[PDB]
Design a protein around this ligand. Structure first.
Ligand SMILES: CCCCCCCC/C=C\CCCCCCCC(=O)O[C@H](COC(=O)CCCCCCCCCCCCCCC)COP(=O)(O)OCCN
Ligand SMILES: CCCCCCCC/C=C\CCCCCCCC(=O)O[C@H](COC(=O)CCCCCCCCCCCCCCC)COP(=O)(O)OCCN
Ligand SMILES: CCCCCCCC/C=C\CCCCCCCC(=O)O[C@H](COC(=O)CCCCCCCCCCCCCCC)COP(=O)(O)OCCN
Ligand SMILES: CCCCCCCC/C=C\CCCCCCCC(=O)O[C@H](COC(=O)CCCCCCCCCCCCCCC)COP(=O)(O)OCCN
Ligand SMILES: CCCCCCCC/C=C\CCCCCCCC(=O)O[C@H](COC(=O)CCCCCCCCCCCCCCC)COP(=O)(O)OCCN
Ligand SMILES: *[C@@H]1O[C@H](CO)[C@@H](O[C@@H]2O[C@H](CO)[C@@H](O[C@@H]3O[C@H](CO)[C@@H](O)[C@H](O)[C@@H]3O)[C@H](O)[C@H]2NC(C)=O)[C@H](O)[C@H]1NC(C)=O
Ligand SMILES: COCC(CCO[C@H]1CC[C@@]2(C)C(=CC[C@H]3[C@@H]4C[C@@H]5O[C@]6(CC[C@@H](C)CO6)[C@@H](C)[C@@H]5[C@@]4(C)CC[C@@H]32)C1)COC
Ligand SMILES: O=C(Nc1ccc(S(=O)(=O)Nc2nccs2)cc1)C(c1ccccc1)c1ccccc1
Ligand SMILES: *[C@@H]1O[C@H](CO)[C@@H](O[C@@H]2O[C@H](CO)[C@@H](O)[C@H](O)[C@H]2NC(C)=O)[C@H](O)[C@H]1NC(C)=O
Ligand SMILES: *[C@@H]1O[C@H](CO)[C@@H](O)[C@H](O)[C@H]1NC(C)=O
Ligand SMILES: *[C@@H]1O[C@H](CO)[C@@H](O)[C@H](O)[C@H]1NC(C)=O
Ligand SMILES: *[C@@H]1O[C@H](CO)[C@@H](O)[C@H](O)[C@H]1NC(C)=O
Ligand SMILES: *[C@@H]1O[C@H](CO)[C@@H](O)[C@H](O)[C@H]1NC(C)=O
Ligand SMILES: *[C@@H]1O[C@H](CO)[C@@H](O)[C@H](O)[C@H]1NC(C)=O
Lengths: 1129, 122, 173
């Protein structure tokens, strides 16, 4: 016929390649920010070609006057959509809806190559298995959201308000100039009336009046806003700020709430999402894998060169020269004196020369073009050629940074190193076998990128001064394609809310909500799938006589418990050494003498341990050796202050080692003992992987030193703390000629050398700190030149690349090797369940026996007179489904609650939930009449009973508080029985029950690991109290959250525990010199001096806490995943 | 941005004798405030003749009704939703010329404009 | 930051002393200009007569003989924002032993809103010829010794009890 002609064209591979290339070039064309006139014609061409393919498909599966052919293929639906609304778009008056037409062409990128279809489908089945976890996640988010809503109902609205000299209260609340705008924040400061809350300055009072602490955004005074804020808490995006605002409004006492959600909403639900995605991917892998003359001279010199000593002290010498080359790369300082830069450049020339020499020696013993077959030789040739090109040019502008590719020589160590070879294998799998999936990621990111622009770009250009002070575009916009990619990449990283606020203030609420939620769901699902994909591809008369007695003393339970109590009291003795210690003068001396008592007890128990266990056995024990060291430092302190060297710079600095006193509790407790045993047993492989990670971050940090060698130095106007304009000041010369108002300030985190390079890369990879790092690196123009706003705008790519490699691949290898090590440890050598002791093991086994229990219908009929009637007409489906419907309706009534709802609305809701509580009491009593004898065989019945009792008691308590001595801060807390009234949902909600049971199963191991973590926070909080209770009031450290007291230190360390905002807490400590801090500022009521902590101990403190918390949280994660696997498989 | 977008047409002709509604509205982003807005209408008489004044409303309801051209203008705008316009009292053979509608919105920095030839057809 | 500490009540005759009065700001970041007055009544008098005044740089004194050439300033040194108010009294005598009132008047600056706050700190001192140790310190030291000796007795008693047990038990073989 004639359709047969339109078949060969359809299946011909050149047609598919044409479609691929036209989609790719159209995609490159959507990148354009402001398309010139002529491009329009090309755009027409594109849609014409698209019509082409549709024609080819529409004359291929329908014959003899047939209408629809490509409508059983879902992607053909998208093709039909784009071809139709392209010509609908061709009628411009038929409109500001281009944003819904161009994006349809944007989504067409998915089907560039066959194979992405299967990957998208596989992602679809992966998200299909997310039903139970997503429903549990939304339920928990809603529950904690109502908790936060009825607790902080409008407290986040609290602000400082002046006290008037005397319309009245109408244009006083709504002035926004009568509020305390904290300097350099452009957002009114929060306060509160209760204690342990934000303090309104002298001359202000805290009033619940104004907008919420943003442009009017994710606060707690609405259920929708509460749900958004707790989705933010569940993803932990910038939750330091929500933490700070909530605790500044409602008081520090409420922080326990966060400890719940952070441990329950974020820590647990993320783990469950990861675990179920992992099970889906493992099932996918299991299914897929179970389914399937002159030649005489040349040869005579080859005789020697191939015989030139290969293994002894040459190839090993070549490797050690590679290591020395990396070393010479390391000493790249920013502040450089001559005769040092000369040394480095002559060493670099020597090394590129020796590499060229060895290459020409290896291409005359394996032939010039037979040599390019091992693969490693190809890589060596490419890298040596790049080095030779760099030395030859030495004059290219903007591209001398290609120099850094010489660091690729480090990867030659992969020939010997097995673990870095595993890293290279993971990279190859990312680009190779799983590259399709990786491609999807990029494509999806690209899609959202362009989509974002088409939906928001123009808006961000016109609505700009709505969000700014200079009305120029913010540093994170979508006006051009690159920034739209950057925002999507940042959303993938996890920092979404800060830009989402800007979007929602520029381009309305619903559009940006939908866009950013779609990105955060789809893109993170893709990223997690890729991460797990690479993860799963990893694989005599007195002596003895007294000795026995003292052994019986030291082994007895009485003495051990007394010693444990002394440990707790001695550790607590440090907590009272506040900023407020001198004001007491009674606890001060009391704890001073308690120090002597505790040291005496400690020395005596050490002596009994000495005389009982014996010196050899007491020094073969790590715990006893550590205890002896701590007793030694305590005894040295006692000798010092008895003799009188107390106020000596070295001895007083040694006094801060008292913070290690709680460390001896590790041995006495079972939980810390077993958890530290597991950690320090797994520490060798962790150390090997850490060696690999510091090697690869050394590569990236030396690259960063080359890219940003001390170019961060920017002038600042010392009356406002702001950068200069390029016009007024350009470089170092005029910055030194700008009187004294110019500082030539640094960034305090930079790339001056591999040390600061490691610090900055740690901040970037943890994603909490990259703000000023990226901003200044992009600002970086050149040495001694003042930075310019987004001048070197493409340096973002570097960080992007780093985050892909040094934070997504390195952490991937780290987690994979930890998975392998723990697998080996639990299965082969050791107990099957680490992090739990023997008694905890018995608890776990008894709970396992308890969980798989069901009743063998031991409920006979009641006695007489219609009790059996209700008994038998209550058990049926009707009653249970009805009570769940009433629970859900009560939940919906709960969500209606809002700030500033009229007294009538409160009365209506009170009547409605009176109706609900009565209908639940009559229900409880119906089941009672059904089962008057016992009714307590199953814990769900006793849960219903206790929750109904709690609701009634809370109801009466609310009435009492509302017609007696009244306090709203107690009413809000006591109103929490309704939360259990809706938690009653768990009884019949299958799936949720199993996952919460997994929580209950993992609770012992999580408790042990979290007890070790709490001890770690205790030690670090006391050390910070000793050190950083005196730092300046910079960004992260302020009056409310700082290291002054123990409560403030513990809340700061809880903020840090999830790596949140530790950049802000490290910023003030990094101050070292008079320009930033001041070494002699006498504090009122303190004999101490100086308001800046020691930088070295500051970095050590924060980086050590980050690493220890990361290891502890990884142990928690592994425990949860183990529980999920055990319950499921 | 480059300018301020105005939904102004090219040229519109209104029959004589009827009441004249002279429209010029701009679709901006920023939430409107009825206290600080700026609005000045211009017109080009000769090739490069300097304007004197055409309309007013630069701080509040301010009217001109100048006898230089005609007796006209009635406030028929409502800036509440990006829509401010006026009227003209009597379309006559003395209603011809290029009558611009320059604008200025305070919270942004763009002086937008729209040019239409006020004439008569039939 | 800043901490409010109650000054020591017991001074010493003939020695020196430092009367403390710390009025910490509610917010540490607020720029302010602070000055103060110190008004003392002696034991046996019922009034509060001005004796010391502190302003931006130099303090002024009333011409009372009880403090002429005798009191110096140990507040915050030249910061225009005092936040620390202590009088260092040299060669303490009997004629200053009674009640001080510490009126700290702080003009808090703000964006455009000037505040004029006043806070009173009533401190009590009693000059004494002999600097006896405070009750808290003596009780603390005595209880320290009691705890040490009691625990030593406890451990020696436990050792002797276990010695009796092992003598009764191991003597069999
Ligand atoms: C595949 C899409 C490739 C798009 C390359 C950008 C095209 C260059 C261009 O003219 O865009 C102009 C701006 O150019 C750029 O900003 C280049 C940015 C390149 C970033 C590459 C990121 C790749 C995104 C997918 C992963 C628009 O004006
Ligand atoms: C998760 C489901 C989120 C649904 C919106 C949550 C409540 C929003 C709401 O009711 O806003 C309250 C007022 O609601 C409205 O005015 C209408 C809201 C309609 C928004 C439609 C959004 C479409 C969602 C994707 C399709 C306040
Ligand atoms: C995901 C889809 C969410 C779609 C919700 C569309 C928004 C509905 C329209 C709306 O404004 O409801 C808003 C609802 O609030 C929300 O944003 C709901 C957020 C739900 C996120 C769920 C994440 C899971 C209320 O805003 P407003 O108080 O009227 O505006 C005050 C600003 N000054
Ligand atoms: C995976 C690990 C990736 C990298 C991990 C940690 C990188 C450590 C960052 C070092 C920053 C060095 C910059 C620097 O100059 O700090 C200098 C000293 O800094 C240090 O000592 C860093 C000490 C790092 C200790 C790492 C703790 C390991 C925890 C084991 C568990 C002092 O600077 P200053 O201005 O002279 O005073
Ligand atoms: C579960 C599925 C949907 C549950 C959605 C619950 C949240 C949305 C409805 C409650 C809500 O937020 O509406 C609040 C009040 O509106 C109402 O709920 C009254 C209208 C009653 C509609 C009841 C909806 C019942 C839903 C099905 C049952 C908004 O508070 P606002 O003070 O007007 O906002 C001012 C903020 N500047
Ligand atoms: C924290 O405690 C302060 C101290 O009482 C509370 O200040 C009180 O604020 C309310 C309004 O927020 C004042 O009510 C009056 O309302 C009329 C209009 O009905 C208005 O004309 C008055 O000027 C005044 O605003 C009340 O007088 C005021 N109390 C005092 C002693 O100043 C504040 O509301 C509390 N905030 C929270 C969140 O607990
Ligand atoms: C009035 C005093 O104001 C507050 C000061 C901080 C304080 C004492 C407050 C109560 C909870 C306390 C917290 C419970 C959390 O428990 C912990 C400890 C264990 C962590 C695994 C989890 O959180 C602390 C970080 C957290 C905490 C112990 C630190 C200190 C907190 C009161
Ligand atoms: O209505 C009332 N009090 C009330 C309190 C809180 C809630 S509540 O919305 O916050 N839900 C809750 N669940 C657990 C705790 S509170 C609802 C109602 C009183 C009432 C007033 C007028 C007519 C009828 C009753 C009342 C007084 C004595 C005994 C009961 C009720
Ligand atoms: C630093 O910038 C100043 C800018 O003033 C340079 O001084 C000269 O400035 C004038 C006008 O400002 C320019 O026309 C000259 O071109 C500048 N000189 C040069 C050599 O370019 C100053 O030279 C700069 N110095 C450094 C070290 O960058
Ligand atoms: C410092 O800031 C002030 C702000 O008013 C400005 O006037 C001054 O010019 C700046 N100083 C410089 C850049 O010389
Ligand atoms: C103390 O004051 C009394 C007032 O009567 C005076 O007589 C006496 O000399 C004073 N002594 C000293 C040491 O100032
Ligand atoms: C108190 O004042 C004396 C005398 O002026 C001075 O020597 C001493 O250093 C001061 N002490 C403090 C803490 O200001
Ligand atoms: C203090 O005064 C007494 C007598 O009033 C005198 O004996 C003593 O030396 C004085 N001490 C000082 C330090 O002035
Ligand atoms: C207000 O400030 C002035 C400034 O000198 C001061 O004299 C006055 O005592 C202050 N007001 C009060 C009530 O103290």
């Amino acid at each position: 016929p004639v359709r047969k002609i339109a078949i060969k064209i359809l299946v011909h591979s050149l047609f598919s390649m044409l479609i691929m290339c036209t989609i790719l070039t159209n995609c490159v064309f959507m990148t354009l920010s402001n398309p010139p006139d002529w491009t329009k014609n090309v755009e027409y061409t594109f849609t014409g070609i698209y019509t082409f393919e549709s024609l080819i498909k529409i004359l291929a599966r329908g014959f003899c006057l047939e209408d629809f052919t490509f409508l059983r293929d879902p992607w053909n639906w998208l093709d039909f959509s784009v071809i139709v609304m392209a010509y609908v778009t061709e009628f411009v008056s038929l409109v500001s809806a281009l944003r819904t037409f161009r994006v349809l062409r944007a989504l067409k990128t998915i089907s560039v190559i066959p194979g992405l279809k299967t990957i998208v489908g596989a992602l679809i089945q992966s998200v299909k298995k997310l039903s139970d976890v997503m429903i549990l996640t939304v339920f928990c988010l809603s529950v904690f959201a109502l908790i936060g809503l009825q607790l902080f109902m409008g407290n986040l609205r609290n602000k400082c308000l002046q006290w008037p000299p005397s319309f009245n209260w109408k244009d006083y609340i709504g002035d926004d100039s009568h509020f305390y705008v904290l300097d350099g924040q452009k957002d009114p400061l929060l306060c509160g009336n209760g204690s342990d809350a934000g303090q309104c300055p002298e001359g202000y009072i805290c009033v619940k009046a104004g907008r919420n602490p943003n442009y009017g955004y994710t606060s707690f005074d609405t259920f929708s806003w509460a749900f958004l804020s707790l989705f933010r808490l569940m993803t932990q995006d910038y939750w330091e700020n929500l933490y700070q605002l909530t605790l500044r409004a409602a008081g520090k006492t409420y922080m326990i709430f966060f400890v719940l959600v952070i441990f329950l909403g974020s820590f647990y639900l993320v783990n469950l999402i990861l675990a179920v995605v992992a099970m889906a991917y493992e099932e996918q892998n299991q299914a897929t894998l179970e389914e399937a003359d002159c030649c005489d001279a040349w040869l005579k010199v080859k005789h020697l060169v191939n015989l030139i000593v290969m293994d002894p002290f040459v190839d090993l010498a070549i490797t050690i020269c590679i290591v020395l080359n990396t070393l010479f790369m390391a000493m790249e300082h920013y502040p450089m004196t001559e005769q040092f830069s000369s040394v480095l450049t002559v060493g670099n020339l020597v090394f590129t020369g020796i590499f060229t020499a060895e290459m020409v020696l290896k291409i005359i013993a394996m032939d010039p073009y037979y040599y390019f077959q091992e693969g490693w030789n190809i890589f060596d040739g490419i890298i040596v050629s790049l080095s030779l090109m760099e030395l030859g040019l030495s004059n290219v502008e903007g591209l001398s940074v290609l120099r850094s590719f010489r660091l690729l020589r480090v990867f030659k160590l992969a020939k010997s190193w097995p673990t870095l070879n595993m890293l290279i294998k993971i990279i190859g799998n990312s680009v190779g076998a799983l590259g399709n999936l990786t491609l999807v990621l990029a494509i999806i990111v690209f899609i959202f990128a362009v989509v974002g622009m088409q939906l928001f770009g123009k808006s961000y250009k016109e609505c700009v001064c709505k969000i700014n002070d200079d009305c120029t575009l913010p540093r994170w916009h979508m006006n051009d394609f690159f920034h739209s990619f950057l925002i999507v990449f940042r959303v993938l990283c996890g920092e979404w809310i800060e830009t989402m606020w800007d979007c929602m203030e520029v381009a309305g609420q619903t559009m940006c909500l939908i866009v950013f939620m779609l990105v955060m769901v789809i893109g993170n699902l893709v990223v997690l799938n890729l991460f797990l994909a690479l993860l799963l591809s990893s694989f005599g008369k007195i002596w003895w006589n007294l000795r026995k007695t003292c052994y019986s003393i030291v082994e007895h339970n009485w003495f051990e418990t007394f010693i444990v109590f002394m440990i707790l009291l001695s550790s607590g003795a440090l907590a009272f050494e506040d900023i407020y210690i001198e004001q007491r003068k009674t606890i001060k001396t009391m704890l001073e003498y308690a120090d002597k008592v505790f040291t005496y007890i400690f020395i005596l128990e050490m002596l009994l341990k000495w005389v009982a266990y014996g010196f050899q056995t007491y020094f073969t024990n790590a715990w006893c050796w550590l205890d002896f060291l701590i007793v030694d430092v305590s005894l040295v302190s006692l000798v010092a202050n008895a003799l009188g060297y107390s106020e000596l710079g070295a001895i007083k600095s040694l006094r801060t080692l008292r913070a290690l006193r709680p460390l001896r509790a590790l041995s006495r407790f079972e939980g810390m003992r077993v958890v530290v045993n597991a950690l320090v047993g797994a520490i060798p492989s962790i150390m090997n992987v850490l060696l690999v990670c510091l090697i690869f971050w050394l590569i990236f940090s030396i690259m960063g030193v080359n890219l940003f060698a001390g170019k961060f130095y920017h002038c600042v106007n010392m009356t406002t703390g702001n950068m200069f304009d390029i016009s007024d000041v350009n470089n170092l010369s005029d910055c030194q000629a700008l009187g004294k108002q110019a500082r030539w300030k640094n960034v305090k985190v930079n790339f001056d050398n591999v040390g600061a390079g490691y610090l900055a890369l740690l901040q970037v990879a943890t994603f909490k700190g990259w703000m000023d790092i990226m901003y200044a690196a992009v600002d970086s123009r050149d040495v001694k030149l003042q930075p310019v706003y987004e001048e070197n705008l493409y340096m973002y790519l570097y960080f992007v690349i780093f985050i892909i490699f040094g934070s997504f691949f390195t952490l991937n290898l780290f987690i994979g090797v930890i998975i392998d090590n723990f697998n080996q440890q639990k299965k082969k050598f050791g107990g099957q369940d680490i992090f739990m002791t023997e008694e905890q093991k018995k608890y776990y086994n008894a709970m396992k026996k308890l969980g798989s229990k069901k009743p063998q219908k031991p409920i006979p009929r009641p006695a007489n007179k219609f009790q059996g009637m209700v008994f038998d007409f209550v058990t049926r489906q009707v009653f249970d489904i009805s009570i769940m419907i009433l629970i859900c309706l009560n939940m919906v009534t709960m969500m209606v609650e809002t700030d500033d709802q009229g007294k009538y609305m409160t009365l209506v809701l009170s009547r409605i939930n009176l109706v609900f509580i009565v209908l639940f009491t009559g229900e409880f009593v119906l089941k009672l009449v059904s089962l008057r004898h016992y009714y307590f065989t199953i814990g769900w019945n006793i849960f219903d009973f206790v929750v109904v009792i709690l609701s009634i008691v809370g109801m009466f308590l609310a009435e009492m508080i509302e017609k007696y001595f009244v306090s709203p801060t107690l009413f809000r807390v006591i109103r929490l029985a309704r939360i259990g009234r809706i938690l009653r949902l768990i009884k019949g909600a299958k799936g949720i029950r199993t996952l919460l049971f997994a929580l209950m199963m993992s609770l012992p191991a999580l408790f042990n690991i979290g007890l070790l973590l709490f001890l770690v926070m205790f030690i670090y909080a006391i050390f910070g109290m000793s050190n950083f209770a005196y730092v300046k009031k910079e960004a992260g450290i302020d009056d409310m959250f700082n290291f002054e007291t123990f409560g403030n230190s513990m809340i700061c360390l809880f903020q840090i525990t999830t790596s949140a905002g530790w950049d802000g807490l490290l910023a003030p400590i990094l101050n070292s010199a008079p320009p930033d801090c001041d070494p002699d500022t006498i504090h009122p009521g303190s004999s101490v001096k100086g308001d800046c902590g020691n930088p070295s101990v500051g970095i050590f403190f924060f980086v050590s806490y980050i690493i220890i918390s990361f290891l502890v949280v990884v142990n928690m994660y592994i425990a949860v995943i183990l529980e999920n696997f055990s319950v499921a498989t | 941005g480059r300018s301020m977008e105005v939904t102004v047409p090219a040229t519109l002709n209104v029959l004589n004798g009827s009441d004249a509604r002279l429209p010029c509205t701009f679709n901006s982003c920023y939430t409107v405030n009825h206290k600080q807005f700026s609005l000045n209408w211009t017109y080009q008489e000769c090739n490069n003749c300097s304007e004197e004044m055409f309309l007013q409303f630069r701080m509040k309801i301010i009217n001109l009704k100048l006898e230089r051209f005609q007796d006209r203008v009635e406030f028929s705008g409502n800036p509440s939703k990006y829509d401010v316009s006026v009227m003209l009292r009597n379309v006559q053979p003395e209603d011809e010329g290029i009558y611009n509608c320059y604008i200025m919105n305070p919270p942004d920095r763009h002086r937008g404009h729209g040019k239409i030839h006020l004439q008569v057809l039939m | 930051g800043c901490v409010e500490v109650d000054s020591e009540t017991e001074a010493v005759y003939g020695m020196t002393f430092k009367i403390l009065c710390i009025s910490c700001k509610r917010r540490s970041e607020t720029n302010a200009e602070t000055f103060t007055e110190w008004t003392f009544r002696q034991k046996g008098t019922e009034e509060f007569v001005k004796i010391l005044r502190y302003e931006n740089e130099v303090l002024q004194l009333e011409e009372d003989e009880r403090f002429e050439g005798r009191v110096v300033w140990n507040g915050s040194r030249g910061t225009k924002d005092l936040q620390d108010l202590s009088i260092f009294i040299t060669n303490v005598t009997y004629n200053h032993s009674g009640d001080y009132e510490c009126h700290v008047y702080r003009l808090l600056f703000f964006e455009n809103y000037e505040h004029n706050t006043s806070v009173v700190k009533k401190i009590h001192i009693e000059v004494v010829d002999k600097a006896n140790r405070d009750m808290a310190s003596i009780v603390s030291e005595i209880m320290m010794y009691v705890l040490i000796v009691v625990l030593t007795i406890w451990l020696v008693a436990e050792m002797i009890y276990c010695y009796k047990k092992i003598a009764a038990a191991t003597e069999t073989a």
